[PDB]
Amino acid sequence: SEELLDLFNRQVTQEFTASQVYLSASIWFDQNDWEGMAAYMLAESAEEREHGLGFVDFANKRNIPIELQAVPAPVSCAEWSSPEDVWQSILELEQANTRSLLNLAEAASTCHDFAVMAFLNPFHLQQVNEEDKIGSILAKVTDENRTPGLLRSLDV
Amino acid sequence: SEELLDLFNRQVTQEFTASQVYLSASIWFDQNDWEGMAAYMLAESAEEREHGLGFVDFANKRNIPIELQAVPAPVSCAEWSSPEDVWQSILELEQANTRSLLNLAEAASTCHDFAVMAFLNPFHLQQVNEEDKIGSILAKVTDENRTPGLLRSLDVVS
Amino acid sequence: EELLDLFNRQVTQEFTASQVYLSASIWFDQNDWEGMAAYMLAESAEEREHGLGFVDFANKRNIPIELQAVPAPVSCAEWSSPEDVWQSILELEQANTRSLLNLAEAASTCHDFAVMAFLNPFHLQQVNEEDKIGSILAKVTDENRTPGLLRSLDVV
Amino acid sequence: EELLDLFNRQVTQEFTASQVYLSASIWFDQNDWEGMAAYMLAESAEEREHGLGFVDFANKRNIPIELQAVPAPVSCAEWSSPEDVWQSILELEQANTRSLLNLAEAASTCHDFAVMAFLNPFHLQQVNEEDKIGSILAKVTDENRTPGLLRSLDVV
Amino acid sequence: SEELLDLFNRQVTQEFTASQVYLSASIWFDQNDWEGMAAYMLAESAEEREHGLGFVDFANKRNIPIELQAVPAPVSCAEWSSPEDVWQSILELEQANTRSLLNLAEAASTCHDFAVMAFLNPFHLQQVNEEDKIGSILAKVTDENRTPGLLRSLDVVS
Amino acid sequence: ELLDLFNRQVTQEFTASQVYLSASIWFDQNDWEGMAAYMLAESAEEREHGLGFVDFANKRNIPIELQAVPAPVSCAEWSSPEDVWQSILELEQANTRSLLNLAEAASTCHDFAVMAFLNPFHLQQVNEEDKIGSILAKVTDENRTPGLLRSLDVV
Ligand SMILES: [Fe+3]
Ligand SMILES: [Fe+3]
Ligand SMILES: [Fe+3]
Ligand SMILES: [Fe+3]
Ligand SMILES: [Fe+3]
Ligand SMILES: [Fe+3]
């Protein structure tokens, strides 16, 4: 179950990585005068970090040794040119978050780690909601952005 | 101009670095059953991150380009043996945080960037308070750790 | 001295800005942009309040104030769409930031610590103000690309 | 059009009176009459609200407004006691009354019944204003016959 | 640097000194039956002392060694013979209080001590208000004392 | 002289106020924030007593000449909280002696109003000496085990 301790560490790292990527997206939104979209990303940034803290807290309680990895620089921001690009990368991030949680659940299942499985249950359910929501926002952005100016309306 | 813009950008990295080292301390304290000290380190971790977000927000408004950098793996944790070690690393962290702010203020000064200097003032004053507070806690920790079990007795209280 | 002269000029620049905001509110009102008009009117009162704050401080610090003419606004003659108005307003705020920086430079030269402390919150407020007008202008320029679309968001 | 011209001259007069009242507050403040300074300051704000009321009316009624320069108040350079200040203020109010009566006369000639209705409460207000200033000026010139006594009454 | 540290110490002494000078002014007013003026001075004395305490507390946080000096006796009371003399000495005390702070800021500036500069900003602004308020009371006093007994109205009011 | 001693009681109160302030400074610089807050509160209170004496002297036409308030000097030689508390006990004993000498001079002059004014200060000095005495005893007891006194500064 090195594989398990490992994946559990990778999950913590994925949560903080995703928090930074959300922060990068709020920065791009802000810089380009989409304050509504920026507020939304900033709030998701804080939430991803809360998920990381929740995994750490659980690992401490269960004596899963956690060691903090570097949180890499978000990369996609240098390539974003419009809100559509940003929301697409955020959907890909969320798909990565889902995979990372499934990888861990798979390893827990193999080890018969029932406590880890019970712990992950609300995060599986949260990811379903998260993916659906981002996917749904991206569809609106992509439909609205077909008329010059109209997406500025969505920005609330 | 280059210097100021780079340093401002780097100040955000230093805020998030400090956030992660606070978090690593919390995990050490937790793993070693110092839950009072862990909760304190945890709250400081949130607070450092809020400072880095205030620098980001100001940079956005002032058109200072921000490029978010890697937040490095905290390293002091592999070598911590006792609460005193962790608090001493936290003191060094705050002293570093103060130095990075004074450097930034030094560049803002050279550049005559009055806005950045105004923005920095409450951070300077906050750093004075933070160093004092951590210095004080370390002195308390080092004094109580002289009698076996006594320091534990304070984690439980305050 | 040079510091007295500039302190006076800042007063004049605040009252000039207050009138330029009023001129913008009139153009928007006459062209049926009531929400943009209400916004300019609000800014006009607030520039005047800054003017009064400088005067109050100068009287306390024995800096003599000579009230200058507030010149007739002249951009309204060229405005023909909301984008032209907002562009003139961003240039007004850039000039406000400049008048304030010149005053700060002279206070710094004379080592006038109390003047510098007084200007700090105005420094920070000018950051917010430039950002905010820049952002509305970017939004206006984007929405204006579809006929009627700007109008529908003046109703907001 | 006499009417349009005069309606514009009325706005300028309101904003001019606002600036003159401000000049008077400065003189009072500089000379440590904080009670009188606060009174002149409140009156400065009210005069500007009147000018805003005429501008708003003018916009609704399609009276084109071009905002003219607000001249530097210059009386301040020769004021040397509160009596001089209050006397200039009375003179300012008598000029406010004349411009309003001039405007009403042109409205009347043009049979402009909407303008006439709009002017009624300003005619009544000017009545109250001249009475009030004339009455303060009588108190000030009576109390100033005893050294220090006027001061004792700036404790408003 | 020694000079900043020394001026910081002298700033504390200047605040306590002004506190005692205000107290001397309330005593003279009270002895001569100007209880309104006496209450004003007494409020100002507690306030100056609060300033000295704020300076002490900042110095402690920032490890600026403080050594309390003697608070010298007020000297001007022996020569006051009317409220005008008192308010005039009080305006002079506040002019010195402002010079004293300006000197300290100049030394902080030379040293690039941005934390000290940030800490002094509200004291620079408070001195502006204090010198204007005292200057205006002095003007009112010297005007009203032109008519025998009239000044005795200022008092039995403010 | 009653008048001379009355004037000197003012100086003693403000002297005590400053020594208490010197003691908060030492505790604060040495990270005893609990003891520092207590000293600071006692500093304010000693100054209030001095103000009460001045106010009574003004009412009773006792001329008040404010004297120099001397520099506290025990701070030079404090190296533990026990030293600081020992100096404060001596300060309060001094405060008590100067009130008794003032009372003695009032008694000799049959100054009944001064004696009546002093009564609550005599009772307050009894409480003060007891409380400081009692703190010094707790401090000297707890300081026999390394770090233990620190643990109770948090109180
Ligand atoms: Fe997550
Ligand atoms: Fe920080
Ligand atoms: Fe402004
Ligand atoms: Fe009017
Ligand atoms: Fe002060
Ligand atoms: Fe006492």
CATH number at residue B81: 1.20.1260.10
Cross-chain residue pair D69–C71, CB shorter than 8 Å: yes
Q: Are the beta carbons of D67 and C30 separated by less than 8 Å?
A: no
- In angstroms, rounded to a whole number, what is the distance separating the alpha carbons of residues D60 and D137? 38
Q: Among residues B82, B90, B100, B86, which one has the least CA distance to residue B131?
A: B90
F133: three-class secondary structure by DSSP? helix
Burial class (CB in 10 A: 0-12, 13-18, 19+), F91: buried
Tell me if residue B158 falls in helix, strand or coil.
Answer: coil
Q: Three-state SS for F73?
A: coil
Q: Which residues pair with E71 in a beta bridge?
A: F69
Is F18 annotated in a binding site? The answer is no
The sign of the dihedral angle between the CA atoms of D142, D145, D151, D155 is: negative
Q: Are D100 and D122 spatial neighbours (Cβ–Cβ below 8 Å)?
A: yes
Q: Which two tokens stand for residue A23?
A: 């922060």
Closest CA to E123 of E23, E39, E11: E11
- Residue matched to tokens 């409380």: F131
Cα separation, E80 vs C135, whole angstroms = 62
Ligand 6 centroid–CA F92 distance in Å is 8
Query: Chain B residues with CB inside 8 Å of E118's CB?
Result: 120-122, 124-125
Amino acid letter, residue C15: F
B113 annotated as belonging to a binding site for a ligand: no
| Coil, helix or strand at residue B71 | strand
Q: Which of E117, E124, E16 is nearest to E66 (CA)?
A: E16
- What is the helix (H) or strand (E) element at residue E147, kind and residue range? none
**Ligand 4 mean position, distance from CA D151 (Å):** 28
Q: Is C66 annotated as a binding residue?
A: no
Q: How far is CA A37 from CA A22, A31, B63, C138, in A?
A: 11, 11, 18, 15
Given B53, B68, B74, which is nearest A74 (Cβ)? B68
Q: How far is B96 from chain F (nearest CA, A)?
A: 22
- Angle, vertex CA F86, rays to CA F80 and CA F88, nearest 5: 110
The yes-or-no reply on D/B contact (3 CB pairs or more, < 8 Å) is no
- Measured between CA atoms, the residue of chain C closest to residue A155 is C139
Distance in angstroms (rounded) separating the CA atoms of residues C49 and E80: 43
Q: How many domains does chain A have?
A: 1
What CA–CA distance (Å, rounded) separates C6 from C103?
Answer: 6
Question: Which of B112, B118, B121 is opposite residue C105, by nearest beta carbon?
Answer: B112
Which chain C residues contact residue B115 at CB under 8 A? 123-124, 126-127
- Nearest CA to F2 out of F104, F96, F97, F121 is that of F104
**Reported resolution in A?**
2.1
Give the DSSP H/E element, type plus range, for residue D72. none
- Alpha-carbon gap, residue A41 to B49, rounded angstroms: 16
Reduced to 3 states (helix: H, G, I; strand: E, B; else coil), residue D70 is strand
List phi, psi (to 5°) of E73: -65, 145
Asked if residues E141 and E80 have their Cβ atoms less than 8 Å apart, the reply is: no
Among the bound ligands, the one closest to the CA of F132:
6
Determine the distance separating the centroid of ligand 3 and the alpha carbon of C97, expressed in angstroms: 8
Nearby residues of A5 by Cβ (< 8 Å), 6 or more positions away:
A64, A65
Candidates B57, B60, B73; nearest CB to A68: B73
Token pair of F62, please?
A: 């006792």
Within 10 Å of residue C77's Cβ, how many Cβ atoms? 9
Minimum distance, in Å, between the CA of residue B134 and any CA atom of chain A? 23
Q: Please, what is the end-to-end C-alpha distance for chain D in angstroms? A: 46
Query: What subunits make at least 3 CB pairs under 8 angstroms with E?
Result: B, C, D, F
Cα separation of D14 and D22, whole Å?
A: 12
E112: left (phi over 0), alpha (psi -120 to 50) or beta: left
Q: Which of A31, C32, A95 is nearest to A87 (CA)?
A: A95
B85 is in an annotated binding site: no
Q: Mapping DSSP to helix (H, G, I), strand (E, B) and coil, where does residue F69 land?
A: strand
* Cα separation, D115 vs A26, whole angstroms: 53
Task: Tell me which chain C residues have a C-beta less than 8 angstroms from the C-beta of D72.
Answer: 66-69
Asked if F120 and F52 touch (Cβ cutoff 8 Å), the reply is no
Name the nearest CA neighbour of A22 among B68, B14, B5.
Answer: B68
Nearest to A80 by CA among A89, A91, A67, A69: A89
- Residues paired with residue B71 on neighbouring β-strands, in sequence order: A71
Chains D and E are in contact, defined as 3 or more C-beta pairs closer than 8 angstroms:
yes
Which amino acid is present at E38? A
CA nearest to C88, candidates C27, C16, C24: C24
Max distance between CA atoms of chain A, in angstroms, equals 55
Question: CA of E155, closest CA in chain F: separation in Å?
Answer: 18
Distance from CA of B96 to the nearest CA of C (A): 26
Instruction: Tell me how far the alpha carbon of residue A43 is from its chain's centroid.
Output: 11
* Three-class SS state of D61: coil
- Residue E51 CA to ligand 5 centre (angstroms): 5
Distance A146 CA to ligand 6 centre (A): 81
Nearest chain D Cα to C72, which residue? D69
> In the PDB record, what is the listed experimental method?
X-ray
Nearest to D147 among E140, E146, E158 (CB): E146
A5 Cα–ligand 1 center, Å: 18
DSSP string, E60-96: HHTT-------BPPP-GGGG--SHHHHHHHHHHHHHH
Task: Answer for the pair E18, E93: CB distance below 8 angstroms, yes or no.
Answer: yes
DSSP annotation of C146 reads S
Q: Which ligand has the shortest distance to the CA of D15?
A: 4
Q: What does residue F69 show for φ and ψ, rounded to 5 degrees? A: -95, 115
Among F69, F75, F77, pick the best mutation site for testing chain E contact (most E Cβ within 10 A): F69
Question: Which of these, E63, E58, E59, E72, lies nearest to E16 by C-alpha position?
Answer: E72
Centre of ligand 5 to C-alpha E62, Å, is 20
Q: Measure in Å the smallest separation between the Cα of B146 and chain F Cα atoms.
A: 6
**Are residues E150 and D155, on separate chains, in Cβ contact within 8 Å?**
no
Assign residue D62 a region (left: φ > 0; alpha: ψ between -120 and 50; beta: otherwise): left
Ligand nearest to the CA of B120: 2
Exposed (0-12), middle (13-18) or buried (19+): which is F107, by Cβ within 10 Å? middle
Most C-contacting residue of D26, D27, D34, D46 (CB-CB within 10 A), to test interface: D26
How would you write C6-43 as a 3-class SS string? HHHHHHHHHHHHHHHHHHHHHHHHHCCCHHHHHHHHHH
Neighbouring residues of F57: CB distance < 8 A, sequence distance ≥ 6? F6, F7, F10, F63, F64
Residue of F21, F25, F71 with shortest CB distance to E70: F71
Ligand-binding annotation for C96, yes or no, is: yes
Residue C125 marked in a binding site: yes
The answer to whether A150 and C146 have CB atoms below 8 angstroms apart is: yes
Distance D18 CA to ligand 4 centre (A): 8
Task: Quote the minimal CA–CA distance from E63 to chain F in Å.
Answer: 7
Name beta bridge partners: D70: C70
Per the CB < 8 Å rule, is A60 touching B23?
no
DSSP C74: -
C127 contacts B62? CB cut-off 8 A: yes
CB contact under 8 A, B128 and E58: yes
C-alpha B96 to ligand 2 mean position (Å)? 10
Q: Do C76 and D66 touch (CB under 8 A)?
A: yes
Domain interval for residue C117: 1-156
Identify the DSSP state of E113.
-
Query: Closest approach of chain B CAs to the CA of C115, in angstroms?
Result: 12
CB < 8 Å to C117, chain E: 120-122, 124-125
Site from D61, D67, D74 to mutate, C interface, most C CB atoms within 10 angstroms: D67
Adjacent-strand bridge partners of F69: E71
Task: For residue D57, report the distance from its CA to the centre of ligand 4, in Å.
Answer: 15
**E63 closest CA partner among B51, B139, B40:** B139
- To the nearest whole angstrom, how far is the Cα of B65 from the nearest Cα of chain F? 42
CA–CA dist C143, C35 (Å, integer): 15
**F65 C-beta neighbours (distance < 10 Å), count:** 14
| Crossing angle of the two packed helices C34-60 and C2-30, in degrees rounded to 10 | 160
A48 annotated to a ligand binding site: yes
How far apart CA D16 and CA D104 sit, in angstroms, is 19
Report helix angle C82-109 to B114-144, nearest 10. Answer: 60
Burial B90-106 (b: 16+ CB within 10 A, else e): beebbeebbebbeebbe
Nearest bound ligand to the CA of residue F120: 6
